[PDB]
Symmetry: C3
């Protein structure tokens, strides 16, 4: 099981899960998150390369990907990374990468509610 | 709004990322520009919050994102500015996230 | 010499550069030739009765690297995205907690 190392971020309450994967898997990934009860997410189309350099490389070799950013509590990181990795997986190069980033604060605009 | 940055001692810069209704973008940008905040970066995005949209990809709602990097001391004020201008009073107004930043470099004058 | 000392223990960092779109091919070429192991591109807009505003297209690169590579990569990006006129953009360095490769479940490294 995926175990994310958050030890260099003691006291951080919230993390951002940034998942970049094949565009055709977006509905699967979203269904898996919806079923788990995910409390929100943001989707952006991006382009990129990993270790294999696309397709040296140039802009023409960058490959279309879908990105999701999912801010979750610390306690939910591993579960959510695991769900997104499992849903996005095919077993071939280019299946994606997940970056976990620390978040200092969350503020709901409608209410001014923080934390 | 008070922002808890105690977990990041010694961090000098933060990124304020606001995701909000597209129609409020000109209001948010005007309020920030008038207050003297620069370096705004805008990306259109699609999303859901706690109510699960308008769930599947067709329930994702268009939103506008604005990212601004400020110093630690400026976070609370800039967060408040953004919140006040994005506000409408209805669910779906948006969220603001604050993120630590290690370093800032201006390309035109990089050493 | 990027000051990463408020991030003890953090292994990976994200280099985020926002710059003129016409410089994209050259930035990519430079990083490719130098041997970069990954990047992500996003188009974004800079913000240049309501006051007079203008949205200006820019290109964004996010490049996650190990600590040791941060200064070299920042230097190459700065040099390739430079024109010397006002409006060249900015580079930020952000801490990253974890990196997971989906195909393999491999983390870290
Ligand atoms: N170091 C990195 N920095 C920023 N973005 C990255 C990086 N590595 C990968 N990405 C992004 O994630 C996408 C998917 O990467 P990819 O799945 O090809 O990873 P990889 O490490 O090459 O693994 P694999 O060997 O399975 O292909 C890339 O197209 C790019 O958008
Ligand atoms: N946990 C999250 N992770 C990442 N993005 C999110 C998260 N929650 C909200 N967002 C982004 O912010 C947008 C606005 O969220 P919204 O304002 O609906 O927040 P909410 O917590 O549901 O507040 P409210 O009850 O006022 O609707 C979303 O459409 C999405 O793009
Ligand atoms: O993204 C792909 O579909 C293949 C290319 C790849 O894995 C890479 O550039 O790392
Ligand atoms: O974004 C909206 O307009 C309403 C939907 C919502 O608030 C949500 O999904 O959380
Ligand atoms: Mg790859
Ligand atoms: Mg909502």
């Amino acid at each position: 099981s995926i175990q994310c190392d958050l030890s260099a971020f003691p006291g951080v309450k919230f993390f951002r899960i940034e998942a970049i994967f094949r565009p055709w898997r977006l509905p699967f990934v979203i269904d898996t998150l919806s079923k788990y009860g995910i409390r929100g997410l943001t989707n952006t189309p991006v382009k990129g390369v990993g270790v294999q350099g696309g397709s040296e490389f140039g802009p023409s070799n960058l490959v279309d990907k879908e990105k999701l950013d999912i801010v979750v509590s610390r306690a939910q990181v591993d579960a959510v990374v695991r769900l997104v990795a499992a849903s996005a997986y095919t077993g071939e190069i280019g299946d994606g990468k997940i970056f976990v980033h620390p978040v200092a604060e969350v503020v709901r605009i409608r209410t001014a509610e923080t934390g």
